[PDB]
Design a protein around this nucleic acid. Structure first.
Ligand SMILES: [Zn+2]
Ligand SMILES: [Zn+2]
Ligand SMILES: [Zn+2]
Ligand SMILES: [Zn+2]
Lengths: 82, 79
DNA sequence: CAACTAGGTCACTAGGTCAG
DNA sequence: CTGACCTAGTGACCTAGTG
């Protein structure tokens, strides 16, 4: 089926331009709205965001959402076409 | 080819007397065929209306619909 | 009769909620 | 402070009717 582009979980839809799970849809919006910076990464700027460890590090997570393409400008309402 | 007058998206026909997109087409019908009470624009009632942000401000988008000439009494059926 | 569109449908999503 | 779950809307598609 649908896989979340950011953590690999099951995608619940197409959100902000990329298929994503409900957890990352909310996280992203949440972040990109009521904005504020996230604590500093506790490793190298690369933490493998996965279904089980996605919440362990917000900085690399949010960074990953943008990474894959999420934004308010890539929204697509309605049915899916071709 | 053709474009929507309200948002510049691909027009799909002459709706309410103005080349419009399916999006703006239905949005307009939904507006004037309902208890039109759009929350006042949150940002200086001069919000631009393009493909990327057409859903961001309803009051404006609708305002842009009437602004470009749409209305039920401007409808046309064949040309 | 063909060309073309207003509605009506309903597949889909952004945001709001609120119990973990 | 995360994410399953609802709802208010959005717009792709279809078709009843309309020189
Ligand atoms: Zn995810
Ligand atoms: Zn990290
Ligand atoms: Zn439009
Ligand atoms: Zn506005």
């Amino acid at each position: 089926v649908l896989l979340c582009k950011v953590c690999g979980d099951v995608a619940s839809g197409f959100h902000y331009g990329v298929l994503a799970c409900e957890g990352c849809k909310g996280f992203f919006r949440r972040s990109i709205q009521q904005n504020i910076q996230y604590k500093r990464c506790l490793k190298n700027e690369n933490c493998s965001i996965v279904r089980i460890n996605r919440n362990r590090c917000q900085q690399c997570r949010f960074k990953k959402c943008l990474s894959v393409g999420m934004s308010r400008d890539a929204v697509r309402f309605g049915r899916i076409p071709k």
